[PDB]
Amino acid sequence: RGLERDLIGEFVKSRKTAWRVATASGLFGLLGMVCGIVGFSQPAPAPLVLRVDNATGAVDV
Amino acid sequence: PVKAEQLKSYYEESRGLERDLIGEFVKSRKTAWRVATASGLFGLLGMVCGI
Amino acid sequence: QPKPVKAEQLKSYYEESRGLERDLIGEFVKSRKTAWRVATASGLFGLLGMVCGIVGFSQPAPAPLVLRVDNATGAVDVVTTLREHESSYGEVVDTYWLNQYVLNREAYDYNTIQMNYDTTALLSAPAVQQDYYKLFDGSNARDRVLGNKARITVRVRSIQPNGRGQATVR
Amino acid sequence: QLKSYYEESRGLERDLIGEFVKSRKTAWRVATASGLFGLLGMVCGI
Amino acid sequence: QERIEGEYGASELASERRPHTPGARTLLMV
Amino acid sequence: PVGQFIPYSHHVTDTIISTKNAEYLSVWKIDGRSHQSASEADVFQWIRELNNTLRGISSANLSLWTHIVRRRVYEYPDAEFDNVFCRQLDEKYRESFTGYNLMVNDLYLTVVYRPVDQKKHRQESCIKALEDINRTLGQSFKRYGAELLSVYEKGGHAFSAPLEFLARLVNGEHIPMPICRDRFSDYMAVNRPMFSKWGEVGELRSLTGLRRFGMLEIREYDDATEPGQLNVLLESDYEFVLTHSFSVLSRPAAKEYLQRHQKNLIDARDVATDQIEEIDEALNQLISGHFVMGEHHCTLTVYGETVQQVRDNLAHASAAMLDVAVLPKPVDLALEAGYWAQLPANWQWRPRPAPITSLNFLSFSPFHNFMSGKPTGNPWGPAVTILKTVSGTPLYFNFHASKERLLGNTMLIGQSSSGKTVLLGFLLAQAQKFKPTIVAFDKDRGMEISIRAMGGRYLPLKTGEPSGFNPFQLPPTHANLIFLKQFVKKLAAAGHRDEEEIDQAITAMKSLRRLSLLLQFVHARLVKWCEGGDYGWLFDNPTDALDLSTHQIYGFDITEFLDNPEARTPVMMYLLYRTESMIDGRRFMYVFDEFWKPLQDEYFEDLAKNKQKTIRKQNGIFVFATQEPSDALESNIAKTLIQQCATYIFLANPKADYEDYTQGFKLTDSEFELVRGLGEFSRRFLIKQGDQSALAEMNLGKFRTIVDGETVERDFDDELLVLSGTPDNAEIAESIIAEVGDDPAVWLPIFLDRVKAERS
Amino acid sequence: MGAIESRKLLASETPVGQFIPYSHHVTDTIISTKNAEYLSVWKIDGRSH
């Protein structure tokens, strides 16, 4: 009756929305996950050296 | 009669084959909420370490 | 543990009871299905995280870069495609390496050979390293023939490059 | 048919409720193992 | 919740003990 | 807590309890057929028909538990009369029982059908399959008399009969339970057992008391010798619940098991050609012999009070079963598993089942029990009395029976000298607890003293003495007028226009109303029934103060008017009509000592049959009797009335015609042998109650009882001396009653003194 | 725990059959054995001494 119908309504609404949010948030997590965690998986590079002749003060790049 | 739904839930909670069913799907629902929360937080973590 | 059921509706009671039993069984099998589905998804993110974690490890650092410095001008060079080419450059530089290679390879002293041995290997392609290692093997091994009874002294008189990765050492 | 006396005896000796409880418990255990493995990998990367 | 009255419980044989010859301990120690 | 072992959940239809794991169930209450009434010839046929009907519905889904629960019955209550004589009879007859068995057997068969918009249609398919299985089993068990346990509303609180048996399995005491919205596993247990952790014995925990129980596991493989082998347990001084399960195996599974067993017996270091060939014979006996195998564990759970007493019970049971070639193996650590395996649908907790042929399951539990009747729950309160039986089992006699509303008509065929009258007097005296009206009819003053002791107004008759009857003083109701018209016609017939004259005369015709007055209004023929005529003493009396309101019991003696074909039909119409006018609401009864003379009445028989059809739902209990059956079966209508009878009691009549008992009364040939086996004055009698029977040996001789710690000797010799009726007894009783007065118990000591003087 | 331990302790026992070397009667006076060692028993009314 009323109580069982209310419990079934909570079933449908809340549980279906919980798994729908699970699916959508999981998909968004997958998109960002692949993206960034592949990004920094490639190592990044620093500067190499700058020339400054001690005798001439000449700068070579 | 605010949250008349909570009064309806109490009748389902009363021990019975129906109480077991209701408790079962709400346990499943909070497992879904837990896994969705963990995945959302861990995906946002992956994105933040990447960026 | 409540009082008896409402007798006015026998049919309703066990009608809803069979309905509840079927719905419970269906929901429990569906929950099992979602359980393995979540297990698969967790495995997939677990291995994505592991693969990226390993690939981003500190293994293979920036390749060593030689800023070649000209002794006459003080000009500073940088890393180059010389790694995928002849990295040693300049007669002066090549003759040094050729000298040190021959001297250490051909020479022998029980007391210093471990360094000359490892150095020779360090300055040799695996094919060459093996040829060298073999000179210390078997009953006729340099380690047994010379051992700590005799020693070999080597000196280079002259080195002249003749082409594209090739030189003559006298 | 089943055609295995062991199969029929063990079918009688088995209950659905306990089997499915065990199944979902093992599924969650494996999911937790995979999640912890992922955390281990992310720690390794950082 | 207690052992059920007037039944056969554990054995009465576990009460057995190995007797010691009453000189072994002292002279062994010395 | 305890629900971890009980599988029961809720109902699915009125007669099918469900299970937690969706294993629908049903419970049947099997009375069982008596294994003493029929010789060894028909027992095999019983087993074969049960095998046929089992393999008919054989499937891998099915299963069967079987329980023989023995009780020390307490639900049979003592009753207080309102007369001192009946109280005396009851008290001595109850004291005749100190030290007897007082145990009843109940046999329960449960069928569980576990399957191995589709879902709803499969639910419907499961329940329909189980109900069809129930229909087939019911067709099968017609002779055994089983009833399908189903819900029964009690004043707005719906209940459920099947829960009661499953409760008694675990609770150990019949605790009624309601059907409610929980799963029954939570509260079906009330008194939870407490097994000792070592497991030799157990405990029970009741509001009113407690008990101890140890078990035995009866693991037998050899084909049984008797079709009922271990039926020696049906008679023992200890309670138990003997359990068998038959979890069927699908036919390929049975074939595979037999093949593996033969292989593992072959591949051994010793050759035994007494085994291999037998098993190989059985393997293709299975295909062609058409019996389906299955799992089977047997466990006996004897109850007791002291733990040493339980061990003595176990030793006695072990001896009494080694006497029947089966070796009981005591249970030491498996007791918890064994006990929790008693519940139907607890396949998991069986200790060590091993496959058994279907013939051997139906021959280990063939549903044999000594017939014992219903201790209580009858439509008329408890059972009237508790007859003894050969082999020591208490028959709880009652006229209720079951489906020959509730049929109650009873017949007592046997010689009057050989304890017929004593039996009738005893039954009526001890059934006085119901306070029903008894309308006694007698032959040769059989029951005069008994009725007058029971506070009736038995009216002795006599030829030539004013009867006191005057039918014309009845109130002029439409029914009475019709009767009087018919009545006067019948009188006139002793000697259309006559009818018209009689009608007008009766209509025209309170203190002045008499047959003689009627003449003033056929005349010549009725003169003989008037004052001064041959029969003027019968119906032409000045007054007729004779209505049934004053007393409860009445008895009319027509032994004077028995074989005189002039007016038996009139006098019987009058008595029956006046008594029938009294038949409303009151719990009611007739007694006919001999009925075949009134039976050949043309007019009265149709009225009797129609009134029977009307009364069957109105608490009507005829109690017919006959001195010798050949007297009854001489009349054709007597067969028609005999077909409508509930319980037959058979006295000892050596001079019994073969045809009469054999096909006239639907008796068996073996029962006909048992009737002749009784001596001339054996004082036993075979009670065919429904479709089962036993020798209810009643003996009202000397008995020993303990009064204040001393063994005293007593008897019912005195009671049967006052119970039976003889003409000298009748004249002494009449003289006393005439001089002393009316009250029942004032004269009885005087009667005792006078009869003692006569006996000297 | 307190429910299942009965079967757990049950199945983990060495039955006495491991120690009793007998099997089917092969002849009405001779008993077999798992190692196929046939024997017969001789009840004797020992003579007086």
Long-range contacts of D34-39 (CB under 8 A, 24+ apart): D34/C39, D34/C42, D34/C43, D34/C45, D34/C46, D35/B38, D35/C42, D35/C45, D35/C46, D37/C46, D37/C47, D37/C49, D37/C50, D38/B42, D38/C42, D38/C45, D38/C46, D38/C47, D38/C48, D38/C49, D38/C50, D39/C49
Cross-chain residue pair F9–B17, CB shorter than 8 Å:
yes
State chain B's maximal CA–CA distance in angstroms: 52
Residues shown for chain B: 51
Tokens of F212: 């101890």
DSSP F328: P
Distance CA C118, CA F712 (A): 122
Distance CA F448, CA F536 (A): 25
Ordered DSSP codes for F646-700? SEEEE---SS--HHIIIIIS---HHHHHHHHHS-TT----EEEETTEEEE-----
Note whether F601 and F568 are within 8 A (CB): yes
Closest CA to F62 of F18, F22, F7, F113: F113
The interaxial angle of helices A2-10 and B4-13, nearest 10 deg, is 100
∠ CA F234-F236-F239, nearest 5°, is 85
Cross-chain residue pair D45–C39, CB shorter than 8 Å:
no
Count CB neighbours of F452 within 10 A. 26
Distance CA F457, CA F514 (A): 24
> Please, which chains are in contact with F (at least 3 CB pairs closer than 8 A)?
B, C, D, E, G
Instruction: Please name the residue that has the structure tokens 């039926």.
Output: F231
Distance from the Cα of C1 to chain B's closest Cα (Å) equals 8
Instruction: Determine the 3-state secondary structure of F440 from DSSP.
Output: strand
Residues shown for chain G: 49
* Best mutation target, C18, C22, C30, C31, to test chain B (most B CBs within 10 A): C31
Which member of C16, C76, C79 has the closest CB to residue A60? C76
**Strands ordered across the beta sheet of F147-148:** F147-148, F24-30, F103-113, F64-72, F241-245, F298-304, F212-217, F329-330
Distance from the Cα of D28 to chain A's closest Cα (Å) equals 16
Q: Which amino acid appears at position F464 of this protein?
A: G
Instruction: Please name the residue that has the structure tokens 């003990």.
Output: E17
Distance from the Cα of E5 to chain F's closest Cα (Å) equals 8
Note whether F37 and C40 are within 8 A (CB): no
∠ CA F595-F597-F601, nearest 5°, is 105
Please give the method by which this entry was determined: cryo-EM
Distance from the Cα of B45 to chain A's closest Cα (Å) equals 8
Instruction: Please name the residue that has the structure tokens 């000792």.
Output: F196
| Strands F8-13 and F16-19, sheet pairing | antiparallel
* Residues contacting residue C47 through CB under 8 Å, at least 6 positions apart: D37, D38
Distance CA F489, CA F483 (A): 10
Distance CA F353, CA F230 (A): 19
Instruction: Determine the 3-state secondary structure of F469 from DSSP.
Output: coil
Instruction: Determine the 3-state secondary structure of C164 from DSSP.
Output: coil
* Best mutation target, A28, A31, A48, to test chain C (most C CBs within 10 A): A48
Q: What is the CA radius of gyration of chain C?
A: 38
Tokens of B6: 């909570």
State chain F's maximal CA–CA distance in angstroms: 114
Nearest-CA residue of chain F relative to C8? F156
Closest CA to C45 of F559, F357, D38: D38
Cα separation of the two ends of chain B: 49
| Strands F590-591 and F439-442, sheet pairing | parallel
Q: Which amino acid appears at position B50 of this protein?
A: G
* Residues contacting residue D12 through CB under 8 Å, at least 6 positions apart: F247, F295, F347
Phi, psi for residue F368 in degrees, rounded to 5: -100, 135
Tokens of F628: 């010798």
The interaxial angle of helices C10-55 and B17-50, nearest 10 deg, is 20
Note whether G21 and G35 are within 8 A (CB): yes
Tokens of C148: 């700590």
| Beta pairing partners, F28 | F109, F148
User: What was the resolution (in A) of this experimentally determined structure?
Assistant: 4.3
What sign does the CA torsion over F574, F576, F577, F583 have? positive
Cross-chain residue pair B33–A18, CB shorter than 8 Å:
yes
Tokens of F513: 């109303």
Tokens of F627: 């001195």
Distance CA F207, CA F191 (A): 8
Cross-chain residue pair G34–F268, CB shorter than 8 Å:
yes
Distance CA C132, CA C153 (A): 17
Which member of F250, F257, F348 has the closest CB to residue D15? F348
Cross-chain residue pair D34–C57, CB shorter than 8 Å:
no
Q: Please give the sequence-ordered ranges of beta strands (E in DSSP) within F322-425, or none if there are none.
A: 329-330, 385-387, 395-397, 410-413
* Residues contacting residue F300 through CB under 8 Å, at least 6 positions apart: F215, F216, F217, F218, F233, F240, F241, F242, F243, F317, F328
Distance CA F515, CA F469 (A): 11
Count CB neighbours of C117 within 10 A. 19
Q: Which amino acid appears at position D17 of this protein?
A: I
Distance CA F198, CA F214 (A): 12
Phi, psi for residue C37 in degrees, rounded to 5: -65, -45
Buried b (16+ CB within 10 A) or exposed e, F744-753: eeebbeebee
Distance CA F272, CA G25 (A): 8
Residues shown for chain D: 46
> At CB < 8 Å, which residues of chain G contact F?
3, 6-7, 9-10, 23-26, 32-36
Instruction: Determine the 3-state secondary structure of A47 from DSSP.
Output: coil
| Beta pairing partners, F689 | F647, F692
Q: How far is CA F315 from CA F195, F237, F321, F324, F412, in A?
A: 20, 13, 10, 15, 44
Phi, psi for residue F21 in degrees, rounded to 5: -90, 25
Note whether F357 and F293 are within 8 A (CB): yes
Note whether F204 and F310 are within 8 A (CB): no
Tokens of F663: 């096909």
Distance CA F326, CA A7 (A): 58
* Residues contacting residue A32 through CB under 8 Å, at least 6 positions apart: B43, B44, B46, B47, B50
Residue F555 burial (C-beta neighbours within 10 Å; 0-12, 13-18, 19+):
buried
Note whether F13 and F27 are within 8 A (CB): no
Closest CA to F359 of F222, F217, F216: F222
| Beta pairing partners, A59 | A52
Which member of F5, F270, F336 has the closest CB to residue G36? F270
Instruction: Determine the 3-state secondary structure of F59 from DSSP.
Output: coil
Distance CA F226, CA F326 (A): 12
Is chain F in touch with chain B: ≥3 Cβ pairs within 8 A?
Answer: yes
Cross-chain residue pair E7–F197, CB shorter than 8 Å:
no
Tokens of F568: 């038996």
Tabulate helix, strand, coil % of chain F (nearest 5). Answer: 40, 15, 45
Cross-chain residue pair F200–E5, CB shorter than 8 Å:
no
The interaxial angle of helices C10-55 and A16-39, nearest 10 deg, is 0
| Strands F395-397 and F247-248, sheet pairing | unpaired
Q: How far is CA F388 from CA F142, F399, F716, in A?
A: 27, 17, 15
Tokens of F333: 């650590």
Chain F hits for E8, Cβ within 8 Å = 198, 200
Cα separation of the two ends of chain G: 63
* Residues contacting residue D26 through CB under 8 Å, at least 6 positions apart: none
Distance CA F17, CA F184 (A): 10
Closest CA to F153 of C15, C8, B16: C8
Q: Which amino acid appears at position F442 of this protein?
A: D
Note whether C103 and C170 are within 8 A (CB): no
Secondary element (H or E) of residue F216: strand F212-217
- Residue C24, chain F, CB below 8 Å: the answer is no
Cross-chain residue pair D37–C53, CB shorter than 8 Å:
no
Note whether C55 and A41 are within 8 A (CB): yes
Distance CA B26, CA F709 (A): 69
Long-range contacts of B13-18 (CB under 8 A, 24+ apart): B14/C2, B14/F181, B15/C1, B15/F182, B15/F186, B16/F181, B16/F182, B16/F183, B17/C17, B17/C20, B17/C21, B17/C24, B17/F9, B17/F10, B17/F181, B17/F183, B18/A4, B18/C16, B18/C20, B18/F181
Tokens of F351: 């200790």
Q: How far is CA F318 from CA C150, F148, F227, F433, in A?
A: 100, 34, 20, 43
Closest CA to F390 of F605, F180, F101, F646: F101
Q: How far is CA F553 from CA F455, F504, F619, in A?
A: 7, 37, 16
Which member of F5, F269, F351 has the closest CB to residue G36? F269
Measured torsion, CA atoms of residues F559, F560, F561, F566, in degrees rounded to the nearest 10: 140
